[PDB]
Amino acid sequence: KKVITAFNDGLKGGGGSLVGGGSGGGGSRPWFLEYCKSECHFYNGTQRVRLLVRYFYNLEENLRFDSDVGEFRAVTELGRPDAENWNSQPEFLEQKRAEVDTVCRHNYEIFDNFLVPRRVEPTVTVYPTKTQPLEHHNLLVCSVSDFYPGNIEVRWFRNGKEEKTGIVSTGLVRNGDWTFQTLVMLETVPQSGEVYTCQVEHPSLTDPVTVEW
């Protein structure tokens, strides 16, 4: 069973301060947050990878480590002492520089076995929506839900004619539990012979999915 590795956090040092940073608020309950995001960017699996570490103090990103640079770089003056301090530590620098390999590439290989290949087929359904006396433009709804990954194509057709106008959508909606959903609506006033169609394409399917109304 493969073990996922974590990124190593360097210790910051004191001894100095900056002249009053900034609030932009006041009166509110004071809070203090040390937040770090170590991001592995895979441009094509492990073939091309960039590591980007980002440090935040409250609402401000103040320090960054871009594997293409090979050193820490201050984003705001609040992170400069850490950049200078850590950049003068060859051992730490070598460890960080190697993480694109010991953490990013290492963990991808693990996740490539179950996250990269995850596939959940969508459920497609079409249905009208208004208030009965359509009055103005009517609305046809193509509901596509419960799918993964997010890459999906949802197109409306008017007698084999792809509607490139009158489209109203929720866009890609992330449910937070590894599934997505979306509603792609077409504004049009129906006509029996004139049939509307929803075509859905996704990497979990073999052939497009169509639904007529």
Binding site: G14, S17, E34, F42, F111, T123, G176, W178
Partner: protein, 182 residues
């Protein structure tokens, strides 16, 4: 082909609440997070557990470093705090709603900081405490956070639901309303 993906190790320590967090993100979804007080790896989806493991102790070690670092930052900035950033709240169903068919309501809390919020699901005006769950604070592309709260329910025209969210950045709690609508 080409496999474009992003994996993120997100961690933080917050004062004065004395709360930390350590999680992993894959393309915007949580893989797992570590329960700091129990030193245990919690997978977002149970099925993930059989494909890998993570030594929880590594997260606790990191959190201890973030904690020490927070004091250095507070000192370096002369304890100068920022404004609290209130969240946007959205309530939607997980799947198309059909009367009598079990479904899930999602309360999506977005773009806020600090990473702390009080959330309450109300069914017909009364707090619901069973059939609910939530995620930890999830990273965004910027410096802000998002979170998901869930409520299992049975669609009916006699009910209405609310997701009440309170955050230090809000003047008063925010109550987002949701009702079945064929």
């Amino acid at each position: 082909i080409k496999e474009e993906h992003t994996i993120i190790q997100a961690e933080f320590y917050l004062l004065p609440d004395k709360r930390g967090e350590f999680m992993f993100d894959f393309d915007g979804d949580e893989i797992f997070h570590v329960d700091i007080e129990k030193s245990e790896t919690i997978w977002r989806l149970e099925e993930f557990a059989k494909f890998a493991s993570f030594e929880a102790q590594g997260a606790l070690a990191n959190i201890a470093v973030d904690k020490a670092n927070l004091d250095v930052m507070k000192e370096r900035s002369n304890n100068t705090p920022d404004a609290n950033v209130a969240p946007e709240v959205t309530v939607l169903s997980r799947s198309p709603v059909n009367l009598g068919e079990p479904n899930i309501l999602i309360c999506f809390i977005d773009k806020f900081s600090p990473p702390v919020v009080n959330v309450t699901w109300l069914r017909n005006g009364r707090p619901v405490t069973e059939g609910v769950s939530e995620t930890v604070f999830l990273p965004r592309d910027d410096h802000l956070f998002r979170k998901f709260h869930y409520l299992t329910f049975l669609p009916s025209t006699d009910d209405f639901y609310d997701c009440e969210v309170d955050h230090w950045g809000l003047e008063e709690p925010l109550r987002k309303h949701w009702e079945f609508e064929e």
